[PDB]
Amino acid sequence: TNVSIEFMHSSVEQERQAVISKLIARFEKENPGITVKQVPVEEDAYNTKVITLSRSGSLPEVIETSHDYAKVMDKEQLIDRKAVATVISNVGEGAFYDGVLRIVRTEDGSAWTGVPVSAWIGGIWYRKDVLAKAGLEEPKNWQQLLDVAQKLNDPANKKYGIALPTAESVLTEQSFSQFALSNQANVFNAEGKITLDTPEMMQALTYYRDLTANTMPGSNDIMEVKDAFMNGTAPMAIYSTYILPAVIKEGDPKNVGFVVPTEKNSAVYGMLTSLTITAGQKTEETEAAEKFVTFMEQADNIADWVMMSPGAALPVNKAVVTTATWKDNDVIKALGELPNQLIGELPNIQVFGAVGDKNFTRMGDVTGSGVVSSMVHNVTVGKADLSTTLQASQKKLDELI
Ligand SMILES: [K+]
Ligand SMILES: [K+]
C-alpha cells in the first residue's frame, strides 16, 4: 500500500536540490505511503529527456515546465488535464493573482496545462537618479517613453537613451511583444489565425523603430542589453526581473525603478513556471501527484520554492507574501517597494498567442521560426522598409502553418 512517483525539475544546483529535498521530506512526513523521487534535469537537456522517457513509458508523474513548453506537451497529449484541474479546484482559482492562470489555458480554453508556481516578468528598468539629474518624471505611455529616451540620448559620448533588444533572438520578440500587446496587437486573433500584417501591429513596429533610434547601434541581444544597463551606457533597459540579482550584487537597489509599456493598455511580458501532472500513469500514481502538487501550493511550501530565486522569481500564489520566509528574506527587504510593485503588475501579463482564455499552440512554431524577431531586426538594425517586411513576414507565417 505504498506508492512511488517522480518529480522532474531543472534545479541541478546543490543548493536548490537541498530545498527540494526538504520539501519532499515534509511531504512524505504528512503523507505516509507516498515516496517522491527527484529527477534533476539540466534545462539544456530537458526536451531530449522528455521524449526519451515518454517513448519508454517512464515519464515522471510531476514535471516542472515553463508555460510555452507545457503547450508543446499538451499538444502531444502528455498532460493529465483532469489531474491539473483537480489541483486548481483544491486551492481555488482565486488563490492565484489575476492574469496568471489565463496564460496556462489550453488552446480550446477548457482547462490548464499546469499549476503555476512562479513567474518572471519583463519591462522597462531605469535608474531613478539619472532621470532626476535630467529633469524627467517616469514615463507613463509611448509618447512619454520616446521623449525620455530622446532626452537622455547622446551617442557622441557613447551614451544612449534606452537599451533595447534588436537581435534575431527570442528576447527581441518578447520585448517587442510588450509594445505590440500594449497596442492591442497580437500575432493571433481569437479564432486562431495569424494576424501579423495589421494596422495595430504596424503602429507598434513603427513605434519600436522610432524608439530604437535611441539605443546602442547594432544587433543587441541579452548580453548587450544587460551590460549597457549595468555599466551606465543606458539608464533605461527592457529586461526581465533577472536583472534584480545583478543590481543586488553590482549596484544599489534603491536606485532602480520599473515601468510598463502602456498605450491602449499596459502589457508586461511574462514566463510562468508550473508543475504539471502527466497522462497515462496508474490511478494511484496520479492521485499521489495530485496531493504532491496541492502540497506544493500551500503557503510555507510554495514560499520555499519561490525563494530559491529571490528577486528573480515572482510569486503567483497570493499566500507567499504572508509568510515569514518572504518577509524576512534579505534580498526581498533590500528591494523595498519593488517586489510589491512587480506583483502588482501580474494582471498585466500579456504574451503572443494568448488571446482571451485560449493560448494557441501554433505560437510555438511562430516563435520557433524566429520570423517575428527577425522582422523586428530587419527594420531596426537593417533599416529595411517596414511595410513590405511586415507583409513578407505575414506570408512566411501563412506558409509556415
Ligand atoms: K512513475
Ligand atoms: K487522468
Residue numbers in the entry: 27 to 427
Give sentences copied directly from the paper behind this entry.
We also report the first crystal structure of non-lipidated YcjN form (ΔYcjN) to a resolution of 1.95 Å. The crystal structure was solved with P1 symmetry, and the asymmetric unit contained two molecules. The YcjN structure is composed of two α/β domains: the N-terminal domain (NTD) and the C-terminal domain (CTD) that can be divided into two subdomains (CTD1 and CTD2) (shown in teal, gray, and light blue, respectively). The NTD possesses a three-stranded β-sheet flanked by 11 α-helices (excluding linker segments). The CTD is composed of two subdomains (CTD1, residues 145–298 and residues 359–383; CTD2, residues 384–430) and is composed of three β-strands and 13 α-helices. An analysis of the binding pocket revealed that there is no discernible electron density corresponding to a bound ligand deep within the binding pocket. Due to YcjN’s molecular weight and the presence of the CTD2 domain, we group YcjN into subcluster D-I.
YcjN is a putative substrate binding protein expressed from a cluster of genes involved in carbohydrate import and metabolism in Escherichia coli. Furthermore, previous studies using radioactive palmitate labeling have shown that YcjN is a lipoprotein.
